[PDB]
Amino acid sequence: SSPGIWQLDCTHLEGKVILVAVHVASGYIEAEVIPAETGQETAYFLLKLAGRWPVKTVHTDNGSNFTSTTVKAACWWAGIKQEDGIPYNPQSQGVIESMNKELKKIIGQVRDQAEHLKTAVQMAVFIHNHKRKGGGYSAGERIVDIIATDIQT
Amino acid sequence: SSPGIWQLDCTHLEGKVILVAVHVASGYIEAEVIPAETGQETAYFLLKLAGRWPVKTVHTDNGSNFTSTTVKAACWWAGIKQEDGIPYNPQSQGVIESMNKELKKIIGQVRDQAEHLKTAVQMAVFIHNHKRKGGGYSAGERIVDIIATDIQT
Ligand SMILES: O=C(O)CCc1ccc2c(c1)OCO2
Ligand SMILES: O=C(O)CCc1ccc2c(c1)OCO2
């Protein structure tokens, strides 16, 4: 639940991979399309993410990325504690499956407006992060308020 | 705004283009390497940026991107007001030249640790956003505080 905890989530669409990082406490996401989930892509995506948000802990999405020496190199470089993504509380997993289904639905709703899947995915990141949940807050609002509160201290 | 104002900046290294968005009030940046600055690339980069931060105004980096139909379509889609980037304030310009030189210096300092230019650029984005400047705050801390303060009004 802390401000720096993220979860990696890899889902498939149109024979391609969508890599998602979710900020567990807020539901805020960043996502990319990649031809396939290799250590190198995962490493690069974490590096990008950690340059943009204070990523302290990452729950890796599978044991291959947990093992990967490139992923471990990027976590070391960027000051990130790599953890497994084992859902010791089971509702965690249902939350992810639900987000994957939500995102693919958004992708479907914008698919026409975008020539490449990668554009549709960024439109879906946009809609997802701005959606007011519930005076309800968006995930965008939440992540910023969580990290600002954390900074003060 | 201020909280929502971003400036686009395009700089070259190794025959490649580095596209940068700077959050004016904090100095926080996001950046990408692209083969060349076209409207489509710039459009896609803005869509990614606006799905991640609440981007209200962008000062475009040149009149081609200002004019571009695709850039205008992305700005319309993501709710962004496009403006020219003319240094009405002249110190604005020198501020950017100095960041470009600073990013390039970081790039040179990490270039060895990275096979690809895109990796070195993301390392530089990381070092830039985390640097305390410095009881000194980082650009990452500033942008979060600026937007949190804004959400609480
Ligand atoms: O330092 C903190 O815990 C929060 C500050 C912060 C916010 C965004 C960042 C960042 C640091 O590094 C780059 O993106
Ligand atoms: O809503 C605001 O003014 C700030 C909240 C916020 C923060 C990050 C976001 C976002 C919205 O949408 C994209 O990523």
Interchain contact B153–A (C-beta under 8 A)? no
Query: Which ligand is in closest contact with the Cα of A3?
Result: 1
- CA dist B16 and B118 (Å) reads 10
CB A87 within 8 A of CB A61: no
HEC-encoded secondary structure of chain B: CCCCEEEEEEEEECCEEEEEEEECCCCEEEEEEECCCCHHHHHHHHHHHHHHCCCCEEECCCHHHHHCHHHHHHHHHHCCEEECCCCCCHHHHHHHHHHHHHHHHHHHHHHHHCCCHHHHHHHHHHHHHHCECCCCCEHHHHHHHHHHHHHCC
Counting beta carbons within 10 angstroms of the beta carbon of residue B104, is it exposed (0 to 12), middle (13 to 18) or buried (19 or more)? middle
A61 in a known ligand binding site: yes
Cβ of A77 within 8 Å of Cβ of B123? The answer is: yes
Check if B40 contacts A (Cβ < 8 Å): no
What one-character DSSP code corresponds to residue A111?
Answer: G
Cβ–Cβ contact A144 with B under 8 A: yes
Please count the other Cβ atoms lying within 10 Å of the Cβ belonging to residue B84: 11
What CATH number does residue B60 fall under?
3.30.420.10
> Cβ(A26) to ligand 2 under 6 A?
no
A89 vs chain B: nearest CA distance in angstroms? 28
Please count the structural domains in chain A.
1
Specify whether the CB–CB gap between B51 and B30 falls below 8 A: no
CA distance A58 to B69: 39
Sign of CA dihedral A95, A99, A102, A108: negative
Residues 85-124 of A with CB under 8 A from B: 113, 118-119, 122-123
* Contact predicate A11/A106, CB 8 Å: no
Ligand 2: distance of its center to the CA of B55 in Å?
A: 8
Return the residue of A nearest to B147 by Cα.
Answer: A144
Report the separation in Å between the CA atom of A142 and the middle of ligand 2, taken as the mean of its atom positions: 8
Token output for B151: 């959400």
Are A47 and B122 in contact by the 8 Å Cβ rule? The answer is yes
Residue of chain A with shortest Cα separation from B70: A114
CB of B146 within 6 A of ligand 1: the answer is no
Q: Which residue range(s) make up the domain with A146?
A: 1-153
Distances (CA, A) of B134 to B98, B107, B130: 17, 21, 11
Residue B7 pairs in a beta bridge with B22, B59
Strand partners of residue B33: B18
Q: Number of helices and strands (H, E) in chain A? A: 6, 5
Beta carbons within 8 Å of A55's beta carbon, 6+ residues apart? A4, A6, A46, A49, A78, A80
User: How far, in Å, CA of A47 to CA of B116, rounded?
Assistant: 13
Atom of ligand 2 nearest to the CA of A130: 12
By what technique were these coordinates determined?
A: X-ray
Rg (alpha carbons) of chain B, rounded to whole number: 15
At CA B19, angle to CA B34 and CA B7, rounded to 5?
A: 155
Secondary element (H or E) of residue A112: none
